[PDB]
Amino acid sequence: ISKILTLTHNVAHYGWIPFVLYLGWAHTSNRPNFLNLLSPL
Amino acid sequence: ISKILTLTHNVAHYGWIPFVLYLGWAHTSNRPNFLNLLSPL
Amino acid sequence: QAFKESPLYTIALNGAFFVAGVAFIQSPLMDMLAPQL
Amino acid sequence: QAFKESPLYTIALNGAFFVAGVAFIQSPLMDMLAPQL
Amino acid sequence: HQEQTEKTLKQAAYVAAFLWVSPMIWHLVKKQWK
Amino acid sequence: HQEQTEKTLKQAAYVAAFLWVSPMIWHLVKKQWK
Amino acid sequence: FVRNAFTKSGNLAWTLTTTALLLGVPLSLSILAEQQLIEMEKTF
Amino acid sequence: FVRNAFTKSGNLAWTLTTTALLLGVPLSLSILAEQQLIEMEKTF
Amino acid sequence: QLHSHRQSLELVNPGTVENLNKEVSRDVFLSQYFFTGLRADLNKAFSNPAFQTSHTFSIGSQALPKYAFSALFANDNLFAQGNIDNDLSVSGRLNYGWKNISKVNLQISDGQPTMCQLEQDYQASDFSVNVKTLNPGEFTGVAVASFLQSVTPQLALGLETLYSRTDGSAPGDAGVSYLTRYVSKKQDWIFSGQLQANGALIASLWRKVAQNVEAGIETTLQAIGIQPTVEGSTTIGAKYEYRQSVYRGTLDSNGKVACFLERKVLPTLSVLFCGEIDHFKNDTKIGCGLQFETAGNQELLMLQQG
Amino acid sequence: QLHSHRQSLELVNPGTVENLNKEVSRDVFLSQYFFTGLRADLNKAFSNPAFQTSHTFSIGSQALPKYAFSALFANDNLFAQGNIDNDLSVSGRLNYGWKNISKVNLQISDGQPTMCQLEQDYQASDFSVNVKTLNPGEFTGVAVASFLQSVTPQLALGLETLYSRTDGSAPGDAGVSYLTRYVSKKQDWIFSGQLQANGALIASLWRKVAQNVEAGIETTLQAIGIQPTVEGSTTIGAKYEYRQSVYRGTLDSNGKVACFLERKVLPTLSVLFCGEIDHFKNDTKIGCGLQFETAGNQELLMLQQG
Numbered sequence A, B: 001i002s003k004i005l006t007l008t009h010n011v012a013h014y015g016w017i018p019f020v021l022y023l024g025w026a027h028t029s030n031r032p033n034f035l036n037l038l039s040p041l
Numbered sequence C, D: 001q002a003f004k005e006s007p008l009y010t011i012a013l014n015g016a017f018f019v020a021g022v023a024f025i026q027s028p029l030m031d032m033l034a035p036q037l
Numbered sequence E, F: 001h002q003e004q005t006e007k008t009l010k011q012a013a014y015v016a017a018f019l020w021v022s023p024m025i026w027h028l029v030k031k032q033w034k
Numbered sequence G, H: 001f002v003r004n005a006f007t008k009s010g011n012l013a014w015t016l017t018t019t020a021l022l023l024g025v026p027l028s029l030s031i032l033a034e035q036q037l038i039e040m041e042k043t044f
Numbered sequence I, J: 001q002l003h004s005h006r007q008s009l010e011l012v013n014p015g016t017v018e019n020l021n022k023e024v025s026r027d028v029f030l031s032q033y034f035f036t037g038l039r040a041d042l043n044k045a046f047s048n049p050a051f052q053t054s055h056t057f058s059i060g061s062q063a064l065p066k067y068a069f070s071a072l073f074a075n076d077n078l079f080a081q082g083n084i085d086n087d088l089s090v091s092g093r094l095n096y097g098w099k100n101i102s103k104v105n106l107q108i109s110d111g112q113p114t115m116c117q118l119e120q121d122y123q124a125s126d127f128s129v130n131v132k133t134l135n136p137g138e139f140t141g142v143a144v145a146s147f148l149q150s151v152t153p154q155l156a157l158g159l160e161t162l163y164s165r166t167d168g169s170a171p172g173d174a175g176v177s178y179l180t181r182y183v184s185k186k187q188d189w190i191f192s193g194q195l196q197a198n199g200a201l202i203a204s205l206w207r208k209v210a211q212n213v214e215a216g217i218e219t220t221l222q223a224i225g226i227q228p229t230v231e232g233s234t235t236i237g238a239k240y241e242y243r244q245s246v247y248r249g250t251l252d253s254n255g256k257v258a259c260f261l262e263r264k265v266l267p268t269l270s271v272l273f274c275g276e277i278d279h280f281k282n283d284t285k286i287g288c289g290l291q292f293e294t295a296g297n298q299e300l301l302m303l304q305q306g
């Protein structure tokens, strides 16, 4: 029963940085698709 | 008697770099006195 | 070296560096180092 | 790794690097890297 | 061990000092004007 | 030790090879023109 | 497997981009130092 | 003595001139980068 | 009966406890900008609610990852971040500042289990309050409060406590401190001060010279009959801001010098350099590297040139 | 009888044995310009018979003195030098080139007793000869001769010997080598070659691209039944000369890169930078520093500006 207190911490271990990209993907003119994980342009 | 073969090598140990300054001291317009051992001007 | 090993040696050292240092800041000498152009 | 420990492994390695390298120099590809301006 | 018995009053005097001084320094403007 | 006895003729053959080839390669322009 | 087929080809994308930032960026500063001079003296 | 009264005051002329080449030369490059700009835009 | 006599002519509010010594230690002293190896980070921005995406490479630096992705997002009232590096370590921050803002700073590692925080603030025109805990019959962890307010139009002083308890069946300690800050008469030299636990004390000031030149001094004194062990370090800095250049550089007691130039040779690219000489062991560290940005929107890059 | 048939249409003379591989190894490969710490040398000149006086500071470099005075003097036919450093070590060189020039290179240290040399040259329009000894019933030391001449208007090949004898009552050895050099048809790619003692061999070339771009490759193969131990290293360089900038930079086998920029930002002052990444141990070296000159005569400094 105590594992959910530790399984909650293992949700943020892999599912927090992808949440931040989804926020500002909508707060633009909503163009780009995969250029955001790319260095030149 | 053999010391003069070693005392000759101890003449160049202290008396060679001051010889080079005396050569080009004459091959100028013969102005400077002590500015040559000086960094700014 | 009879007092350089004492603990009170450093707290008189750095405290003396503050006083002359803070006088160097509040000064017209420190105004000179700012270039006017 | 039965021949990577042999002494003849390196003298075939660097000798193969010379041939493709010297072809890279004498080439119009090497002319391209000189900027025209 | 009687250390943990008196440590609870060692600690309780520490926060009780903060209970005096922050109401004390709440209103020094009402008295610094002499 | 007889090593130092024959080493002087080990070394003397080395400079004698140089004595042949540098006069040999002195004048290959006078014969490369066939 | 996953823990071998990525990191053995993830480290390869490092060495080809700490190289091209080391031999290419000092060259790129030196072009502009000759680029802007050929047009400043083109104006006169 | 000679081997003490010079080297104990020869090393002092080192530390006062590897300091003034370290805190003074990056400052001197930054003046000229603002010096030449204030006259290039004075011409126009 | 006595409240309204003085609360009509006064009460400018001071800054927070974090920004007490901000104007010297984190502005004119380079102790957080320094590095050792080579590093070259680059970041595309396509913002108004902003957006960034920064990468970072580094080599031979002893305190830096060899890769670091990032992101952020900040509209009129929010904040976020994210920072994953070469093997695995995730970070994150939040702000929800409706005047009482409220941060959360999580920090996951692998060898060390889990770091968490929480914060608070309040600025009610004459005083500031900072409330901060750490990771928590079970009242465990660290909990720090504070207080700071101003009693004259130039001076302000307050204090802060703490309460640290670990090790399970262990009572726990509680330290204390004292703070102070003086502002000059017309926007000039700001003398700060501090007196934390275990004897250590800080002092500083910040003289604003003519247009873009600053100054600053700092001084720390940190302290079986071998326990009195004091130490000291007095540092002196300056900073010469210009257009398209920034230069700062300090020197101190016990033998050190430092320098930090940043010369932006493009509209959108800049290099830097930082190096240090020690004068006891006679050994030196030199670090250099670049930093530049671009754009990803189809017209944002058109609106930075002209 | 046979001499005058070919000695009227031919016989351009080749360079010396020292300048055999000069146009690649000491021109486009930075293996003698590199350093590690900081260094900042400066030199006043008041020359026509020239004159210089150079100082040199360095710190944290593992192969450099922390001070080095110098001087030189060179009229139409003479040369001299001098180089004293921090504790004591004196050097010196001479030239008296009336066509057979004749150098002397003395080198005094303190832990190692005394180094001496002597040299010679001869250039008689179709061949070159280098004669060199070292410090000498007493025929002791090293003695090196050479020969090099050209048999076609583009090719040249010769050889050189040596004779090393130390340890008093010891006979001494004598190695041998072979040399070669080919020139292109119209002032272009120059293939050199070498085959020295103990198996080692060198190969190189040098393509002159359009205006100011070069190239170059180099290759060495240096070699109780554990004695066959060969090794190899193939390097590739380039050099981009410009007005008021010089850039070169190589990369090779077994994992290394290098770069060397020199950007002269004044008429009479210049900075430089050089750094290297290893890709096995993943560790790096960074060195930077400046170099500038001035004048000491009352009118020579007036004739470098305009």
Ligand SMILES: CCCCCCCCCCCCCC(=O)OC[C@H](COP(=O)(O)OCCN)OC(=O)CCCCCCCCCCCCC
Residues within 6 Å of the ligand: G018, G021, G022, G025, G026, G029, H018, H021, H022, H025, H026, H029, H033, I038, I039, I040, I057, I058, I059, I261, I263, I265, I271, I272, I273, I288, I289, I290, J038, J039, J040, J057, J058, J059, J261, J263, J265, J271, J273, J288, J289, J290
């Ligand atoms: C793994 C990924 C790594 C990527 C690595 C990339 C590194 C690239 C670093 C580039 C640095 C190149 C240095 C350089 O070129 O200097 C240029 C700059 C001045 O050039 P400007 O364009 O400003 O000139 C304008 C013309 N009026 O000058 C400067 O910027 C400042 C340089 C100052 C040098 C100061 C020398 C200090 C001397 C110390 C003395 C020591 C004595 C003990």
